[PDB]
Amino acid sequence: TDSEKVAEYLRRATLDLRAARQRIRELESDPIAIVSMACRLPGGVNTPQRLWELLREGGETLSGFPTDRGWDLARLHHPDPDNPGTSYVDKGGFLDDAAGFDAEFFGVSPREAAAMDPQQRLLLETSWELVENAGIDPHSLRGTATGVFLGVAKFGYGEDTAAAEDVEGYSVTGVAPAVASGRISYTMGLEGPSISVDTACSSSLVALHLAVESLRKGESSMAVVGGAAVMATPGVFVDFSRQRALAADGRSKAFGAGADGFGFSEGVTLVLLERLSEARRNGHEVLAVVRGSALNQDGASNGLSAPSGPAQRRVIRQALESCGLEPGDVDAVEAHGTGTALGDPIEANALLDTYGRDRDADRPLWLGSVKSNIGHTQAAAGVTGLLKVVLALRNGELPATLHVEEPTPHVDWSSGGVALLAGNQPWRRGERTRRAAVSAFGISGTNAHVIVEEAPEREHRETTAHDGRPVPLVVSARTTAALRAQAAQIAELLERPDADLAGVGLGLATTRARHEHRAAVVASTREEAVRGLREIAAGAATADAVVEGVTEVDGRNVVFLFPGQGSQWAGMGAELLSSSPVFAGKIRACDESMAPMQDWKVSDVLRQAPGAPGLDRVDVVQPVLFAVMVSLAELWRSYGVEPAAVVGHSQGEIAAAHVAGALTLEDAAKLVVGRSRLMRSLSGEGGMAAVGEAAVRERLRPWQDVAAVNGPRSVVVSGEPGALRAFSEDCAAEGIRVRDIDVDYASHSPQIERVREELLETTGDIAPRPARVTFHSTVESRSMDGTELDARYWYRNLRETVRFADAVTRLAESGYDAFIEVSPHPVVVQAVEEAVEEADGAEDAVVVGSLHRDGGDLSAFLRSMATAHVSGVDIRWDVALPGAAPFALPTYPFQRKRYWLQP
């Protein structure tokens, strides 16, 4: 009615208003989470943990000049501050040797690797480490919309050397700021925008602001924000010593007596950013959150490179207003202090003017710096300050600044608004939310201020699911040495008292990319896993529960095989039934489908229950084998291995018919039961023998009884007992070995003709349906259809020979490479391997069984799966690990080599 539709319109208007306001808020200000970080810093620091330890303990990283870079150390040093071409400063914080690199991992000709400056190499390594640390498989990032923003300079590597053969143009592209991010995106295969920016020594925060804006707009889904600065020539030192703007001992003493120049240092630092909602929805880890930022310029001020207080006050107020907060909601501020005798007083006065005014007397703002123990880092200053703030938030402590024992008399600390950090002070999580600010000032006159806030409450929800079940471990690398180093790392990590085996397994399974060289170990106890890892890291692997291989392709066409009689070994399972739920469910369903006609249950026979039929009977051999085979096929399919082709053999073809989907389970079970019941009557009229096809064919001339051929030397002969015995004695006289098979008749012989049409009455109502797989018959050696199977086809199958080898060779020539068996015991693996080798197909063909006569446990199945996986077949291991949680893991063990350009 009218009122109903008017009320509906009112409701729609209200809902749309809510949505519009929410969208406006999302576009204006949306929290952005920090996922992970990576860094390389002087003093042998390459992990955030080491940096936090150094900051908390309290220490410096001062050092002497490098030597491998070829600098003229003897002549460069001179005590005269006015001597041209020299400097009066010899100490400094110099980063670890940069000539190391692993060109083969990324893939680069050694000449090109020598061409590139160390900045791009370190950027590549740090980017890979950063991606790995976040818990994201790097190969999963291909084709996404990830963007790169970073601050790079042109310090001047590799210009003294003259030009040479450069047809590839390596020299031009080696040293260029844009090419750095270009190469990063090219190697990682990203597709978002790539930006290289540089604004004095505050470039990193500008890049962070740009990335935040891009993420809020929605143009990109991920952001990689970083800064890099590595010196190559000592020209910068001479240039700055010309101005006498360097400390006497190279120590930065921000906010303290005896302020001097700023010590110099190198470093690279990157972080990964994503929207808070997306990170929460995707289950990533959140460490902190960024609220807002602001930018401005000093404008017309005294001189060119001189700080301006009003600009800093305005930018701080702008950032605070943009965040929608109040100045009384900040606990600590990471100040930008280079130790200069002029910038520090004005910076501190501005900070006291803005935050200090109206500050609570009992809650002073804590002031500190990071450069007091690592020195200036040029474009990487802001990101390093953010790193320190993040670490302090995570550990709940505030590191104390150094060289502060007499505060600068210019700054009036008597107001009490701002308190200077002296010793470590606890900052544990409590009621009031914890926040911090980071500021950065550039030489060109640009200013940046960023507000960071603690992560929300942890979800917790910690559960345990380890029950002693077997666990697989997979390792992979692009080189043998790298593989061994990774194995050693995992082995030493597993010895911790925690040693969450399920967590380590899951992390190895679903966080690290798989490379050419692969290896796997299946273990159920920590001691045996450590033993296997030590063995594989030793260089030579001999243990059975240890597999390894080399593979290039990452996708194979799968063909299932269903061999006939031959395995029938007492006990099919009795350990899977308890463990595997899918296997037990399939067995129970198959038993219920065929339950009507007979009485004894398949499960009871398998479980060796008392009062069950013995295994020496056709009526119990056939359906039990069929059920076991179909259950094993279902179990294999449960791990994401869908067969592209299906091949049967003898009665196994029936099981194949069910795998192809061309028949119903009940109808197939009825067929098997009827065949067994009709055939059991024809007992004691023949036998099989295994043994030169033409030679054996012509040797059968004296008699009138050939069963199947499975290879060049795989010949099966079915014959009447008298003539079979005579031929066996003749072969024994010849000396060629002959083995009989467990059978009370001779199938595919004239004995089959006795029943013949009697099968037809028992084989009515066999209405088939089209099959979604490529079932290929071994009788006609031709691909079949979903309706060509009839009682006539089954009778023909029970009467003619099998050209199994011909079908195998045809499939091998077709293009299929992955061959996998299903029977409880392998009986055809050797013949299939020989036939594949004799064919002209690819040499990457893989043949692997399912179980073994002695090995019938879930561990054996996992070992077979690992053997198939290390050769190229895709396997989703995470299914085998239910209810597990990930774990922290070490990064890739690069194999570095020296690559430097000697002037």
Side-chain angles (χ1 to χ4, degrees), residues 98-122 124-125 157-158 166 168-171 173-175 183 895-902:
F101 191 52
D102 190 349
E104 279 76 7
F105 181 87
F106 310 99
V108 162
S109 68
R111 173 144 37 76
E112 182 180 11
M116 323 207 314
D117 55 353
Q119 290 176 324
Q120 303 185 26
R121 294 172 267 180
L122 296 178
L124 289 169
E125 290 189 355
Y157 167 87
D166 197 24
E168 329 90 337
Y170 290 147
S171 294
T173 63
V175 280
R183 200 189 312 279
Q895 309 311 296
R896 299 186 177 87
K897 289 181 180 176
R898 178 170 166 82
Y899 281 102
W900 192 262
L901 184 51
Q902 282 291 325

Side-chain angles (χ1 to χ4, degrees), residues 150 261 343 624 705 746:
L150 81 176
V624 161
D705 59 347

